[PDB]
Amino acid sequence: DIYIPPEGLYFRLLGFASRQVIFARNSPSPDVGLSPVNDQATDQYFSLIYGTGEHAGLYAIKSKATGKVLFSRRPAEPYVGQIDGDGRYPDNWFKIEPGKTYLSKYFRLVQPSTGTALVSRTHLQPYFWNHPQTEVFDDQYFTFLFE
Ligand SMILES: OC[C@H]1O[C@@H](O[C@H]2[C@H](O)[C@@H](O)[C@@H](O)O[C@@H]2CO)[C@H](O)[C@@H](O)[C@H]1O
Ligand SMILES: OC[C@H]1O[C@@H](O[C@H]2[C@H](O)[C@@H](O)[C@@H](O)O[C@@H]2CO)[C@H](O)[C@@H](O)[C@H]1O
């Protein structure tokens, strides 16, 4: 019962471990990362693109500020970022994987073909990153924050 929004409805992605939201911006560098929940800046907002055909069941994550979609990959560095193209690459496509107990209202964002999960944390850099999906930590959990 994690609500997943339709296309066109905007949200921010809050991390359980970091209490911050993902940003995707034009400038300054870096162009992706984490920023303060309280700011509610446009570059914290995203909407989903629903995958079809080979990406049926997966979602791309499109920035309101830049129009680009998030990627999560290995082994090419850097491991996370944004790019043009509305999900033209396999690493733009995420599975939403709900947690349990205290994470029942959160989920991982797993990019299945590279086998990575997004990370949002405060204890180690990079603060916004990814991790092999097979090894689970609390800081891979996110929740949609809507207006
Ligand atoms: O979904 C991301 C795609 O990235 C492409 O690599 C980009 C790269 O991130 C950027 O820094 C710059 O160097 O241009 C590259 C070419 O667009 C990959 O080629 C593609 O496979 C995806 O990882
Ligand atoms: O879920 C993320 C986990 O990352 C682990 O740290 C990684 C780090 O992100 C990577 O860059 C490299 O240095 O290897 C580390 C070990 O796998 C943290 O140790 C773990 O606490 C999580 O944050």
Secondary structure: elements and pairs:
Blueprint: E1 12-15, E2 20-24, E3 32-36, E4 46-50, E5 59-63, E6 69-72, E7 80-83, E8 95-98, E9 107-111, E10 116-120, E11 128-132, E12 142-145
Antiparallel strand pairs: 1-12, 2-3, 4-5, 6-7, 8-9, 9-10, 10-11
Bound molecules: a molecule of 2 linked components (GLC-GAL) (2 copies).
A molecule of 2 linked components (GLC-GAL) is lined by residues 71, 73, 76, 81, 83, 89, 91-92.
3D structure, described in words:
It is a single chain. The protein is mostly beta strands. It has one domain (1-147): Trefoil (Acidic Fibroblast Growth Factor, subunit A). It has strands at 12-15, 20-24, 32-36, 46-50, 59-63, 69-72, 80-83, 95-98, 107-111, 116-120, 128-132, 142-145. It binds a molecule of 2 linked components (GLC-GAL) (2 copies). A molecule of 2 linked components (GLC-GAL) binds next to strand 7. A molecule of 2 linked components (GLC-GAL) is lined by residues 119, 121, 124, 129, 131, 137, 139-140.
Which structural class is indicated by helix and strand composition? mainly beta
Total strand count, please?
Answer: 12
Distance between the termini: 19 Å
Strand content: 35-45%
Q: Which series of helices and strands comes N to C?
A: EEEEEEEEEEEE
The strands making up the biggest β-sheet line up spatially as: 8-9-10-11
**Contiguous helical run count:** 0
CATH class membership: Mainly Beta
The major sheet is characterized as:
4 strands, antiparallel
CATH topology: Trefoil (Acidic Fibroblast Growth Factor, subunit A)
Number of domains: 1
Protein name: Hemolytic lectin LSLa
